[PDB]
From a paper:
Despite remarkable diversity, all RNA-directed transposition systems characterized to date share multiple components: a [name] effector (Cas12k or Cascade), proteins dedicated to target capture (TniQ + TnsC), and a transposase called [name]. By analogy to work from prototypic Tn7 (2), [name] carries out transposon end recognition, pairing, and the chemical steps which result in integration of cognate element DNA. We determine the molecular mechanism of [name] recruitment to the target site (via the AAA+ regulator TnsC) and the structural details of the [name] transposase.
[name] forms a C2-symmetric tetrameric assembly organized around the strand-transfer DNA. The overall architecture and arrangement of functional domains are remarkably similar to the MuA STC. B-L2 helix IIIα (red asterisk) wraps around the back of domain IIα of B-L1 (light purple) to nestle between the B-L1 (light purple and tan) subunits, forming interactions with both. Consistent with this, the DDE catalytic residues (D205, D287, and E321) are positioned at the target–donor junction precisely at the DNA distortion (red star), coordinating a magnesium ion with the scissile phosphate poised for nucleophilic attack. The linker connecting domains Iγ and IIα in the L1-bound [name] subunit snakes underneath each 5′ end of the element in the nontransferred strand, forming stabilizing interactions with the first two nucleotide positions. We observe “melting” of the 5′ end of the nontransferred strand through a flipped-out base (T1).
Author numbering:
A (entry chain C), D (entry chain A): 196 to 288, 295 to 311, 322 to 340, 353 to 519
B (entry chain D), C (entry chain B): 29 to 474
DNA sequence: CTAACCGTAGACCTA
DNA sequence: TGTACAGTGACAAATTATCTGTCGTCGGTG
DNA sequence: CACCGACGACAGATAATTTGTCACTGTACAGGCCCTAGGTCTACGGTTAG
DNA sequence: CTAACCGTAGACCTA
DNA sequence: TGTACAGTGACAAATTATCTGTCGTCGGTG
DNA sequence: CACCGACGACAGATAATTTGTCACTGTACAGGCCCTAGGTCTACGGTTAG
């Protein structure tokens, strides 16, 4: 009956082929979206390679809830102005209701895709129905469509206002941003890491250095991060029945450009592939057998 | 820089409470709300008053308020403050210096004091074990922190002076040390000789092995010079070594970064360094150069532990069969070591990064093609005595011998420099100062 | 000698099945039974057939049939028989003798063979780790079995000869051994002397300490004799030792049960044994006499580890501060050891049984009141040389000295026995054979 | 409607004071009985110090089920002739139904004591309402009453036959004994023991030696025993989800007379105090403090 | 020229 | 940011003994 | 002869088990046990007596 | 008586 | 059946911070 | 004024935490690291020249 009264989530396999940084072929990605049913406006998205099973939506919701703040690189003209909790959130069928509950809204269990197909995806390189497209590029394209076209379009059910304008028009009150740390029930976790002397951690073959983490050299901690950007990781101390936030740590030795999780894995497996090629065609096997024969 | 405790996953009782709460947070007709409270109490089977605290509780603590609150006396001790401090103090003194104290012994000391003070209720031994627990425990992590090392492609090492030295290219900085080989040897007759010393020269930039020697001569400036000689000149081996690859390394370092033991701070090495043109530096601590030391463990693990006569790595693990089983000679072991180094070790992938073999890291990283140093220009590794005086008639004094040869008589009374081979002093090379230059005069015979 | 597998506690699914079964085991009208089957299938939500197997299954296996049957391929390997045996064989050879083989090296050998045989699919390293697992594992228990020891009140020990010797009463069998004390000492000036030897004599029946000595003299027949002397004569100490109890033990053993090292199979000890009237026996193995050795650990744990200059059991644990901190003298340490033994150790409760202190076990167990052996009858511990010949004039040949005294001249040409103190040979006691009896003649002077 | 059609169990605290082997006073015992409701005949008993909670009845049932075979020491004149499963077994409120189930009879949940009071207990030494009585003696007295008096008495509800005779009279068939091992779902257990070299185990400060146990030196096993007689213990191997009988082991170094569990604990607790007695007076404490002072 | 005899020293074993 | 190889959790893929249906057949019962 | 329970021949689906892959972490490299102090047992150049 | 000078040896430090 | 003390699971008893009622009081609402 | 929700003063019951007790088991006792091979640096009885 009003804007943010009811939110609805949706998911699909996206039939666009992605190709990696080294020209290697990757499998097809998943897309999950969150939409406000009052004006049909897109609140937030999640594009990646993981199935919308248990996870993904947790991060998509977080994306919807938190302010957007996109960079110059996405070449956006319009501001993606939403943030804030709904009264109800519908998802496609416990932890999902725990999120609702810790945040303040009711979770329920149980179609933008029609327009992405026609207006974006079927027109992109690698469309499965030769050409290359990385995940980062695809996500830039996707948000450009959503912030500057879809949400700016006037629907046939309204005619007067755009999907975002009606969203604005229907707000019964000024929403107030929630401090981000309040959202740390969504971020993905690694269960155990040890603090290295000086206050450092390893994650995905990168080294991280923490602020005041040094006093714990030798203890076990666990950590959370946003797969879209792993340059800063949240470190938690493990208390009985609680993860109590300890500090933040920054990646070191990497490139200036912000690094995503899929990109880190890719670099690491390329290095492994390379190692598996030198080998010991005869150099090592011969030596071992000869060593044994000479000993005998 | 605070807050954010986020609750752990809730158990079943809390899950039920959660649902109850979801129903009671929402306001509606006051009377209907009242009905919900009654319903809430029946679903929980507690009281009509309880669920007011449960919601209120949720209102401030969210999911955390649904966890079990701990007793909040946890970690506290029920004994007197005097005793808790007494135990902690006693233990800290008990292990000061070279001695050791057991928690058991501490508990006894406590008892003794309790008697003096007429205290009928000191803590029990079991309690002492619990009070000292956190102290015994921290130590276990403290002695076991794993350093991160370096992330790759960039490195430097410190000197005793506190100077940072960069390692920028192949043959920039070389390192050298000494160990024992954990294998007993026999001679050609089956008679046992004590295990040999192994000396290595390692290229810091690439971690490729530059040259080795092993045998029974204790560490000395002489041993070091012999080791360098091998590391510097071009290498070659015969067909008996059954090699597939050539060991291709040679050159000259700029820095000689090594330990502070006397074998390396000698006038002999200094002379070598001056004549060849490189500079020596000393480690600050054993943990400072790890790249020089490290490879010794991989030799034990990949090579020596597979040979007969292997003598473990300590005295705790020394196999009892170690003294009787040895059958290898020095000649045979050296051949094995060379084939191992050449076709396996220097063929492995650099551990820090990429797809470069050790040998390749070294070659890609060497700024220029080296020019071989003529073998005859290694005479500089011979020792120089700073002075003897030439006696009338042309004979000179040396190590309890007189030497004589062409020219010398006409130079009697002059002070001269003597270059000689510590292994064979049949002849001596005699130099004199000419404008502060050391200039060769003659070769004298015993 | 078989059967009886009794099932473990059943989980929830099985619990439901159990109830279903309880209803279906009982026969009734066939049609009604049929109804129960339908009901059974709905309670389980499976099929109308299934529950026939489930009951039948119960009929033979009871509660066990309700457990999950394992896949029965467990423990099997899917690789070829050739390779599984190849891996096992390789490893067994790899550790034969003094050498050591790692599972990783084995996996490589496998790979090498796979190449020779052109086998495109040998097992992976991870697989080798799993195949050898049970072999690495059994060993861990095999090296760590804890013997039961004896149950108390009855005991015997074996000799090298395989003879069983009973231990029936106090001073029946005594044992003796040597160790080092893990404490460095200094002299009255602060200068460090190497740690001392400790020699103990222990009463086997009671486990009470009979006598000790410690100092810097290496083990010898002489040391043993000195140790026995202390263990045999009545003890007494001065007020400076600050003792509460007297150390009350003395007597003479019947058997001397000890090690086979030369210090104990000497002619000197044999002479002692013959003169005092007791017999020596040797251990079969270090594990055979544990009562003699054992107490050395309790001294480290209760006394020595609390003293400055403490080293360690092994060089692996030797405190780095161990060489600098020592300040105790031999005199001081001995005083400490005596007070420790007297008012604490021999005061503890026997470990095997009851409420007897070590000292009391010994006293209650001694058949008779001992008669002190006069101190002057310990001259028998002096060494006897089996022969020297008396020279004309009455002088006799000894250790590069001649000795002379009353009588000897009239006995020249006779062969005589010489008893002397290895510590001071100023005079010698001369014996001659009279009817195969050793009879004293004279005391000769250098 | 017939003998062994329905069994009923009952329990009470027995208000007789027992005194131990060293004249020490013990607390009051529990008694549990099993009775056949057709003729009111006592099938088996369990006398001990543990509450009839979870345990005890399991052993009382086993006692009822298995043949009795009492020794000369109980001075019995009559044979206690029962053995065998009932159709139904009632006890006073899972594991109880698992026993039923593995054995073959139905377990149900929900008064001989009146006669024990009048005809035995109120007349014994230590009756709480000065004198000494051990547990073993009391149990001998109890079974003497049950085998030679209670079950041999003609009840007022019958007049023709004794409680046992009617039991006999009502059997529809000849019962057949069950091999004892089939009853190893009742016996008390210790969860872990290690086999000592040569094949030996410790339990209650006694040593036991097994038959063919030696091949397992170093492995973990678990064990079961009858508290009334711990001279032979049943050893089981631990398989996934099953205790698989391995062997039997006999006590060594003990007295010929069969030893019960309560008696073993008593001897052991008699030594501990004996150890706590002497201690150290000034002795130890003085030495320790002097050691420290001399060191300083 | 030839035979007998105590003190050093060497081979070997063990804790 | 001391150092690099042997050993180890966490998870995906291939193979297979075993459980589940559907139906047919034999035996007991009405 | 018709209906229901028990058993089997057969095919198909399914979790259990094994094997292979990948990232994160513990621990030795840092001069170091073959040497030493007894005893038995015996050989022996030199010395001395016949 | 007096002064100058290479080879042994001792004190000390470190791997 | 090698040996005997330091360290460790499994459980009972004492102390206490915290949860639960029952009732009283204040505030909002009908 | 009457009814219901929120808050508190108060007492009483209750599991959580700590402390003390008892039986079963791992592991060192078993000759053993202060010694050794270099180098620098310097003192020096003896020897030789004036
Ligand atoms: Mg010995
Ligand atoms: Mg060094």
């Amino acid at each position: 009956d009003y804007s943010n009264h009811v939110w609805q989530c949706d998911h699909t396999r996206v039939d666009v082929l992605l190709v990696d940084q080294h020209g290697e072929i990757l499998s097809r990605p998943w897309l999950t979206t969150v939409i406000d049913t009052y004006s049909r406006c897109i609140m937030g998205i999640n594009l990646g390679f993981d199935a919308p099973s248990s996870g993904v939506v947790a991060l998509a919701l977080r994306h919807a809830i938190l302010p957007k703040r996109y960079g110059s690189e996405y070449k956006l003209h319009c501001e993606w102005g939403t943030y804030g909790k709904p009264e109800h959130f519908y998802t496609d069928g416990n932890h999902l209701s725990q999120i609702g509950a810790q945040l303040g809204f009711v979770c329920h269990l149980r179609r933008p895709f029609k327009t992405l197909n026609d207006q974006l995806f079927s027109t992109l390189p690698g469309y499965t129905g030769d050409a290359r497209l990385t995940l980062r590029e695809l996500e830039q394209l996707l948000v450009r469509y959503i912030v500057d076209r879809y949400n700016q379009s006037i629907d046939a059910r309204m005619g007067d206002q755009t999907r975002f304008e009606r969203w604005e028009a229907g707000l019964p009150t000024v929403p107030v941003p929630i401090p981000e740390r309040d959202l740390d029930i969504c971020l993905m976790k690694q269960s155990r890491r040890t603090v290295q002397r000086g206050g450092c951690l390893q994650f995905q073959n990168l080294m991280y250095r923490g602020e005041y983490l040094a006093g714990y050299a030798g203890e076990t901690v666990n950590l959370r991060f946003d797969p879209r950007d792993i340059t800063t990781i949240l470190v938690y101390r493990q208390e009985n029945n609680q993860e109590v936030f300890l500090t933040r740590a920054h990646a070191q030795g990497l490139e200036t450009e912000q690094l995503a999780l899929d990109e880190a894995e890719a670099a690491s497996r390329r290095l492994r592939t390379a190692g598996k090629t030198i080998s010991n065609q005869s150099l090592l096997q011969e030596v071992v057998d000869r060593d044994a024969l000479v000993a005998t | 820089l605070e807050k954010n405790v986020i609750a752990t996953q809730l158990s079943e009782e809390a899950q039920v409470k959660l649902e109850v709460i979801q129903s009671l947070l929402e306001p509606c007709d006051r009377t209907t709300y009242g009905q919900k409270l009654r319903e809430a109490a029946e679903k929980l089977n507690v009281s009509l008053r309880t669920v007011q605290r449960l919601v209120k509780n949720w209102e401030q603590d969210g999911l955390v308020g649904l966890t079990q609150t701990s007793r909040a006396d946890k970690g506290k001790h029920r004994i007197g403050e005097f005793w808790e401090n007494f135990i902690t103090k006693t233990y800290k003194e008990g292990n000061k210096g070279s001695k050791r104290m057991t928690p058991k012994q501490v508990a006894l000391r406590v008892e003794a004091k309790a008697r003096e003070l007429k205290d009928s209720k000191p803590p029990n031994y079991k309690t002492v074990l619990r009070v000292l627990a956190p102290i015994l425990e921290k130590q276990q992590k403290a002695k076991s922190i794993r350093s991160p090392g370096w992330r790759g492609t960039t490195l430097s090492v410190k000197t005793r002076e506190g100077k940072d030295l960069s390692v920028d290219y192949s043959n920039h900085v070389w390192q050298c040390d000494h160990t024992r080989v954990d294998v007993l040897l026999v001679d050609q007759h089956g008679e046992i000789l004590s295990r040999p010393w192994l000396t290595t020269v390692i290229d810091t930039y690439s971690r490729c092995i530059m040259g080795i020697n092993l045998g029974f001569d204790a560490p000395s400036s002489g041993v070091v010079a012999l080791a360098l000689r091998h590391a510097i000149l071009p290498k070659r081996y015969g067909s008996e070594y059954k090699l597939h690859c050539e060991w291709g390394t040679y050159g000259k370092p700029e820095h000689f970064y090594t330990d502070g033991g006397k074998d390396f701070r000698s006038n002999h090495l200094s002379q070598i360094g001056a004549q060849l043109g490189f500079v020596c530096h000393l480690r600050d601590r054993p943990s400072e150069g790890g790249v020089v030391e490290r490879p010794f463990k991989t030799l034990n693990d990949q090579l020596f532990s597979t040979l007969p006569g292997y003598t473990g790595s300590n005295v705790q693990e020394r196999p009892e069969d170690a003294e009787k089983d040895a059958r290898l000679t020095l000649r045979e072991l050296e051949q094995l070591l060379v084939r191992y180094i050449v076709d396996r070790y220097n063929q492995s992938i650099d551990a820090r990064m990429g797809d470069q073999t050790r040998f390749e890291r070294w070659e890609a990283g060497l700024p220029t093609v080296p020019v071989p140093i003529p073998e005859r220009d290694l005479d500089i590794c011979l020792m120089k005595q700073s002075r003897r005086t030439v006696q009338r008639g042309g004979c000179l004094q040396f190590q309890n011998l007189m030497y004589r040869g062409e020219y010398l008589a006409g130079y009697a009374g002059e002070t001269v420099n003597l270059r000689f081979d510590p292994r064979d002093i049949t002849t001596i090379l005699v130099y004199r100062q000419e404008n502060n230059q050391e200039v060769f005069l003659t070769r004298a015979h015993a």
